[PDB]
């Protein structure tokens, strides 16, 4: 809404700052034109210095969802969704969310009727094993680029307002101050679910006269 | 005592580019006193190829011939051409759809109804037909 | 008007038996690539 809020100094604050500072500031025809030009930047700061990273990232080379493989959509969603160390989902939600996507590589790359290779959520408490096994029956979609359908239904089950929102930003466009500032305040007491469990990618809510 | 989902097949349109087989398996085949015995640049290859024509693009065109009938991806890509199927993406009727929908209609039609719903329609107005004056200007 | 005109086309495999094994494999992860941005950009601009 544009209200003041003072955090902490770390990275991803001041990464706030400066986006505050040169994109969200513009008006809306400048928007996008500037989120185009200074794509790259924004991926590698978004990666670099923020809770949310850049989702389009594989093996640390900046990515789009349309230059993204199914297989690597999956393995990024397990990545950033489903903790380790915890061994578990961080939100049900988001397992419901990496569920959906799978279901839906099935139905593309299905060639006539057959069961769901997962048919409750549940057998994603392995999501390794899970897409392992999914992606053996569909083998063709881990050398395939993302159907740009598929990418437009992964756009709006983001947008799903039914769920956690994702804890990455999933394309530049209008929305991405919504996808960027969106759901940031958990980060600080669950650092188990961010990228190097890093604070300076978490922005804290502090007071500058009563930190002293 | 008190109270399986099933998955559906989704359009899928591969460009149907030639399988490059492993090396060993495709030096089988050509004579070993070929490599280097031919001038490239003075071979002439066929890497692209497309049609507009009766039975829609050459993929579905293929499929007519081959097949006899529209698989899938061919049926779906013919509702496309012909405008059966427009593409929407955004909320529609409040919830939020995105696939194909009826142009005139503005349904959502899932890929598995395309068949259902146009096969009758693309067979009739495809290929080989009464000339129709709305095509011709009447 | 008498035009008369033939044509041969040679299966394409025939003419990586004229090239080397490095030539080859370079090849075929170009058109790996190509084909997967191909297909991209064939879906979007079916869909818009």
């Given at each position: 809404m544009?209200?003041?809020?003072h955090?902490?100094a770390?990275?991803?604050?001041m990464?706030?700052?400066?986006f ?5 500031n513009l008006?809306?025809?400048?928007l996008?034109?500037?989120?185009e030009?200074k794509?790259?930047?924004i991926?590698s700061?978004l990666?670099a ?7 389009a990232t594989?093996?640390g080379?900046a990515?789009?969802?349309?230059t ?9 969603l397990?990545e950033?969704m489903?903790i380790?160390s ?12 990496t ?10 790359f299905?060639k006539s009727?057959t069961?769901?290779?997962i048919?409750?959520?549940?057998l994603?408490d392995?999501?390794?094993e ?5 992606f053996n029956?569909?083998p063709?979609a881990?050398e395939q ?5 598929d990418?437009d ?8 307002p ?5 804890p ?8 991405f101050?919504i ?8 980060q ?9 469990q890093?604070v300076q990618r ?6 500058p006269v009563?930190?002293? | 005592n ?6 559906q097949?989704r359009a899928?349109?591969?460009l149907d580019?030639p399988?490059?087989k492993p090396?060993?398996?495709?030096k089988?085949i ?6 280097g015995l ?15 024509g009766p ?7 293929w ?6 009938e529209?698989?899938?991806?061919g049926?779906?890509e013919?509702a496309?051409?012909?405008g059966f199927?427009s593409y ?7 919830r ?10 503005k349904?959502?039609?899932d890929?598995?109804?395309?068949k ?9 107005h495809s290929?080989?037909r009464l000339?129709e004056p ?5 | ?12 495999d ?5 090239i080397t094994?490095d030539?080859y ?5 170009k ?18």
């Amino acid at each position: 809404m544009g209200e003041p809020i003072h955090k902490i100094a770390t990275r991803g604050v001041m990464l706030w700052k400066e986006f505050d500072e040169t994109i969200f500031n513009l008006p809306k025809n400048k928007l996008v034109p500037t989120l185009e030009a200074k794509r790259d930047y924004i991926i590698s700061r978004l990666n670099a210095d923020f809770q949310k990273p850049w989702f389009a990232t594989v093996n640390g080379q900046a990515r789009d969802l349309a230059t993204m493989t199914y297989e690597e959509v999956a393995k990024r969603l397990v990545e950033l969704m489903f903790i380790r160390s915890t061994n578990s989902w961080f939100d049900v939600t988001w397992r419901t969310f990496t569920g959906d996507f799978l279901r839906r590589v099935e139905e593309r790359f299905t060639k006539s009727k057959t069961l769901s290779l997962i048919q409750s959520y549940s057998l994603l408490d392995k999501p390794d094993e899970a897409i392992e096994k999914v992606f053996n029956a569909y083998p063709a979609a881990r050398e395939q680029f993302l159907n740009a359908q598929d990418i437009d239904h992964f756009l709006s089950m983001c947008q799903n307002p039914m769920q956690k929102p994702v804890p990455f930003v999933p394309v530049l466009d209008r929305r991405f101050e919504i996808f960027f500032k969106k759901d940031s305040l958990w980060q600080s007491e669950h650092l188990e679910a961010v990228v190097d469990q890093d604070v300076q990618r978490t922005c804290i809510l502090h007071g500058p006269v009563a930190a002293q | 005592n008190g109270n399986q989902v099933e998955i559906q097949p989704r359009a899928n349109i591969q460009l149907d580019f030639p399988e490059l087989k492993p090396y060993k398996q495709v030096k089988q085949i050509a004579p070993a006193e070929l490599e280097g015995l031919l001038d490239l640049e003075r071979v002439i290859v066929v890497t692209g190829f497309a049609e507009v024509g009766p039975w829609g693009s050459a993929r579905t065109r293929w499929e007519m011939e081959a097949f006899g009938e529209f698989s899938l991806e061919g049926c779906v890509e013919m509702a496309w051409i012909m405008g059966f199927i427009s593409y929407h993406n955004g909320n529609l009727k409040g919830r939020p759809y995105t696939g194909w929908v009826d142009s005139k209609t503005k349904e959502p039609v899932d890929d598995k109804d395309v068949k259902a719903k146009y096969e009758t329609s693309i067979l009739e107005h495809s290929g080989i037909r009464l000339i129709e004056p709305e095509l011709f200007n009447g | 008007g008498q035009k008369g005109g033939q044509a041969i086309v040679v299966h394409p495999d025939y003419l990586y038996g004229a090239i080397t094994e490095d030539r080859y494999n370079e090849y075929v992860a170009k058109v790996s690539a190509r084909e997967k941005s191909a297909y991209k950009f064939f879906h979007n601009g079916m869909i818009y």
